[PDB]
C-alpha cells in the first residue's frame, strides 16, 4: 500500500497551464527555505525550477508514465523526460 510522499519520490507534477511534468520530491537543505504547511518542494526536471505543491497535483511516476511520459514541445520537457528516466537523483545545481 502507498505511503506518504517522501524526498526522492518521482512524480509527474501538475501546474495550471502546463502539461503534467517529470519531477521529484526534493529534500530541504539545512538552512534553506521550508515549504508552506501541507506542501512539498517539487523539483521539475529539464527546467530545474522548484515550486511548492500539494499531493493533489502529484502523480507517482511508475503508475503514470505510460500516460504522461511522451515528448512535448514545451521548453525543457524532453530534457526532463531524459533526466527522470536516466538520472533522477543526481545533483542538477
From Swiss-Prot:
- Which part of the complete protein is shown? 1 to 93 of 671
List the expressing tissues.
Widely expressed. High expression is found in heart, skeletal muscle, ovary and testis. Overexpression is frequently observed in hepatocellular carcinoma samples.
Question: What is the protein's name according to its record?
Answer: Hepatoma-derived growth factor-related protein 2
Q: Which residue numbers delimit the PWWP domain? A: 7-64
Write out the similarity annotation: Belongs to the HDGF family.
What's the domain of life for this entry? Answer: Eukaryota
Name the source organism: Homo sapiens
Question: What this chain does, per the record?
Answer: Acts as an epigenetic regulator of myogenesis in cooperation with DPF3a (isoform 2 of DPF3/BAF45C). Associates with the BAF complex via its interaction with DPF3a and HDGFL2-DPF3a activate myogenic genes by increasing chromatin accessibility through recruitment of SMARCA4/BRG1/BAF190A (ATPase subunit of the BAF complex) to myogenic gene promoters. Promotes the repair of DNA double-strand breaks (DSBs) through the homologous recombination pathway by facilitating the recruitment of the DNA endonuclease RBBP8 to the DSBs.
Where in or outside the cell? Answer: Nucleus; Cytoplasm
Q: How does it assemble?
A: Interacts with HDGF. Interacts with trimethylated 'Lys-36' of histone H3 (H3K36me3). Interacts with trimethylated 'Lys-79' of histone H3 (H3K79me3), but has higher affinity for H3K36me3. Interacts with IWS1. Interacts with H2AX, POGZ, RBBP8 and CBX1. Interacts with histones H3K9me3, H3K27me3 and H3K36me2. Interacts with DPF3a (isoform 2 of DPF3/BAF45C). Interacts with SMARCA4/BRG1/BAF190A, SMARCC1/BAF155 and SMARCD1/BAF60A in a DPF3a-dependent manner.
Amino acid at each position: 500500500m502507498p505511503h506518504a510522499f517522501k524526498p526522492g519520490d518521482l512524480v509527474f507534477a501538475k501546474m495550471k497551464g502546463y502539461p503534467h511534468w517529470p519531477a521529484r520530491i526534493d529534500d530541504i537543505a539545512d538552512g534553506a527555505v521550508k515549504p508552506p504547511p501541507n506542501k512539498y518542494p517539487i523539483f521539475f526536471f529539464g527546467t530545474h525550477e522548484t515550486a511548492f505543491l500539494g499531493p493533489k497535483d502529484l502523480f507517482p511516476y511508475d503508475k503514470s508514465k505510460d500516460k504522461y511520459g511522451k515528448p512535448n514541445k514545451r521548453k525543457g520537457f524532453n530534457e526532463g523526460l531524459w533526466e527522470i528516466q536516466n538520472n533522477p537523483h543526481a545533483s542538477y545545481s
